[PDB]
């Protein structure tokens, strides 16, 4: 995992010892040649997983999430380079440097052979995006984002810590490939009882979990945009790829501690696509949509079917683009008139015909339109579902309604009626803007040529 | 016929012969525990290193 490792520290020298003028160019043509490079973790096999060292290892579940990840990082900086323009020399370089250490934070969290260096890398990852949501967040309200980002987490993760030095005491190793073989079964007890809390709520927080979700539409709201790029696309993955490595463990207790949490997930992706109908803030209207989203993904790691995590995986990759790329639009608007209110600029279809293209794309991958792998996730996940019982259908099938009505009034808001007549300040689409969106839109339906290399493991 | 002792005579150790047998264990001791085994052997690195949790040296 060294060739990536190193290339992405390499990224430090590259923007600390950059010309002035250079710092965007240069870290974008080295992160988009690591991003290039991240497809030789593509030779995966039917069996094995493609295990490099004692300390990292690859399958098809970390594959797609690191691609995704390097992927990210040029897109960010193209994302955050035009409202970081006046900015202070050292700190637009000390910005790209927290966002090239959250990369590198990354790509050894989800190559991470053993647990508690997952761990490790997990919780690492909570200092730079803390920094940059505190630091380069436009508003006050940041501050309070950044206390519970970063509490509900560590509130949640503290007690895995234990629980997983306890698995370190139990089984005598965390390697991951050592506990694919001696998993030993987890009875009904009190004490696996809370070893599974221990186990879950970490991950249940990153997803979010409804009504562990509050922290979300702060953190993703009061970020700067490369801020909610990653948090929407790549953080919230960190606690799906850790209940899909963590529930090996967890058998068979799952089977009845997963009930609360499913139902949790069901009714919460009823509340919060719903909440999405009565939003004013756009940004807000998108953090929600990603806790309605990332509620299938719980749902699809609890009830642990082949096509559950298949549908899980896929609608991974599928909302971490379509995510990023709802912010980066809805960023495209506010960088024009300075609010994030969606009801102030509209009729932009008639200013913006471009820009318009890609918030219809958008709009249309949000509500998972076939045969886009948001369709694919969304419908192996449902798949999955019903043959866990047959009754869901009716709580998936009112998402589906309301996911689409949530996402067309966003684009029936913003882009179509009457402009807004005392608005005169809304410039044409500049060419980073537009690369922007197609860096985002452009791999994710391509993506749907060839589905098989997001459908994880068990594909 | 008694001469007095000079100074420095009477606080002299002397040795005295006797019949009776030296006492083999005057203070009644009983049996002294075993010790503990002592190290040897060559001493060999450590297998697989320090083995704390990840760290393969
Ligand atoms: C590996 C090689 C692959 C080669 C093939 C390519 C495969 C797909 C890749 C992605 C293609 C998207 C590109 C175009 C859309 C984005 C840009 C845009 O809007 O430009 C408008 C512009 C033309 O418009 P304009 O008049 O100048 O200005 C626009 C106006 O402002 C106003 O604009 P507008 O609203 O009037 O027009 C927008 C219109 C709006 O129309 C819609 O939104 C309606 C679409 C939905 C309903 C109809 C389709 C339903 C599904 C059926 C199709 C899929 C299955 C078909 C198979 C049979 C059944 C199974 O969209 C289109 O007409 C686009 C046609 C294709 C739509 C694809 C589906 C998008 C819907 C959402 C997701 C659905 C699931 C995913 C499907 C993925 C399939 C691969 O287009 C261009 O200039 C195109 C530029 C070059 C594009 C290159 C595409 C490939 C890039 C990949 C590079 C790497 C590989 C190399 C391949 C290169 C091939 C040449
Ligand atoms: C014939 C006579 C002459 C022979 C000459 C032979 C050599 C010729 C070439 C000369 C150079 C050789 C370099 C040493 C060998 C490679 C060591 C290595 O990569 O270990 C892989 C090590 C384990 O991977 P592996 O695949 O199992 O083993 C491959 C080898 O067998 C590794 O071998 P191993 O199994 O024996 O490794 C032992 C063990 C293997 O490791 C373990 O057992 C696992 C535990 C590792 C520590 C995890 C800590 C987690 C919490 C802290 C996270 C730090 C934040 C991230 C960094 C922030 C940015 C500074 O390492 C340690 O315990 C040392 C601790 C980690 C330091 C690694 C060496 C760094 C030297 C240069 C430092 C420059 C700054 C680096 C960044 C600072 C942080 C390290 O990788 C990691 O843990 C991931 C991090 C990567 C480490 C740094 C890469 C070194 C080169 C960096 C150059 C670019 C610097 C850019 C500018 C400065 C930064 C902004
Ligand atoms: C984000 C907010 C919510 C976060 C929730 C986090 C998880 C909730 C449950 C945590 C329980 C505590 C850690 C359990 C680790 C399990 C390890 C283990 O081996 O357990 C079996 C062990 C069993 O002991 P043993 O394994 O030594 O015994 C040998 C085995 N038998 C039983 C057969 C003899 O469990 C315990 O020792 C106690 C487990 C329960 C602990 C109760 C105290 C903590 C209560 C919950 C606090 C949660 C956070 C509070 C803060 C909220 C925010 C401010
Ligand atoms: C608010 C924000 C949104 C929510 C975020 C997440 C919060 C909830 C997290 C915990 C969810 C509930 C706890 C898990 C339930 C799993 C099944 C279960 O325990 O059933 C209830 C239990 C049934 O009893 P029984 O199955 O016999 O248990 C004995 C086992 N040897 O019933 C009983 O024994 C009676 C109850 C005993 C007290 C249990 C208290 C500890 C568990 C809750 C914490």
């Excluded at chain 1, 290339?7 to 430090?12: E, K, Q, S, V």
């Excluded at chain 1, 709580?395 to 309301?402: D, E, K, Y």
């Excluded at chain 2, 019949?19 to 190290?39: G, I, K, M």
């Amino acid at each position: 995992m060294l060739k990536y490792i190193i290339p992405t520290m390499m990224l430090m020298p590259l923007t600390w010892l950059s010309k002035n003028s250079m710092i965007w160019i240069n870290t974008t043509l080295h992160s988009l040649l690591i991003s290039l490079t991240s497809l030789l973790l593509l030779n995966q096999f039917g069996d094995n997983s493609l295990n490099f060292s004692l300390t990292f290892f690859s399958d098809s579940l970390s594959t797609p999430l690191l691609i995704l990840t390097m992927w990210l990082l040029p897109l960010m900086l193209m994302a955050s380079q035009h409202h970081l323009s006046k900015e202070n020399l050292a700190r637009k370089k000390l910005f790209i440097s927290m966002l090239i250490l959250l990369q590198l934070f990354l790509i050894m969290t989800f190559t991470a052979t053993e647990l508690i260096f997952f761990y490790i890398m997990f919780e690492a990852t909570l200092v730079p995006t803390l920094i940059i949501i505190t630091r380069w967040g436009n508003q006050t309200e940041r501050l309070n984002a950044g206390l519970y980002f970063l509490f509900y987490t560590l509130a949640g993760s503290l007690p895995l810590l234990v629980a997983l030095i306890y698995i370190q005491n139990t089984m005598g190793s965390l390697n991951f490939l050592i506990l694919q073989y001696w998993v030993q079964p987890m009875p009904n007890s009190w004490s696996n009882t809370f070893m599974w809390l221990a186990c879950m709520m970490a991950f249940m927080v990153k997803m979010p979990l409804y009504g562990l979700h509050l922290w979300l539409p702060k953190a993703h709201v009061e970020a700067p945009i490369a801020g909610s790029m990653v948090l929407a696309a790549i953080l919230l993955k960190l606690g799906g790829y850790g209940m899909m490595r963590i529930t090996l463990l967890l058998n068979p207790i799952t089977d009845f501690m997963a009930y609360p949490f499913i139902m949790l997930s069901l009714w919460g992706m009823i509340m919060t696509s719903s909440i999405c109908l009565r939003q004013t803030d756009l940004k807000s209207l998108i953090a929600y949509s990603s806790v309605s989203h990332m509620a299938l993904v719980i749902v699809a790691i609890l009830i642990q079917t082949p096509w559950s995590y298949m549908g899980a995986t896929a609608l991974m990759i599928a909302h971490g683009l379509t995510s990023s790329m709802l912010f980066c639009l809805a960023n495209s608007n506010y960088e024009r008139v300075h609010s994030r209110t969606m009801i102030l600029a509209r009729g932009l279809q008639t200013l913006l015909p471009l820009m318009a293209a890609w918030w219809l794309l958008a709009s249309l991958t949000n509500l998972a339109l076939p045969p886009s792998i948001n369709l694919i996730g969304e419908l192996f996940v449902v798949m999955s579902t019903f043959s866990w019982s047959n009754i869901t259908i009716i709580l998936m099938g009112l998402n589906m309604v309301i996911t689409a009505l949530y996402s067309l009034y966003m684009l029936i808001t913003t882009q179509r009626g009457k402009h807004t007549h005392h608005i005169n300040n809304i410039l044409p689409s500049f060419t980073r803007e537009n690369a922007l969106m197609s860096l985002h839109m452009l791999p994710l339906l391509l993506l749907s040529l060839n589905p098989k290399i997001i459908l994880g493991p068990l594909y | 016929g008694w001469v007095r002792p000079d100074l420095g005579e009477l606080s002299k150790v002397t040795k005295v012969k006797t019949d009776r047998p030296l006492p083999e264990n005057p203070y009644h001791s009983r049996a002294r525990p075993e010790p503990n085994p002592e190290v040897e052997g060559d001493l060999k690195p450590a297998r697989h290193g320090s083995r704390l949790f990840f760290w393969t040296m």
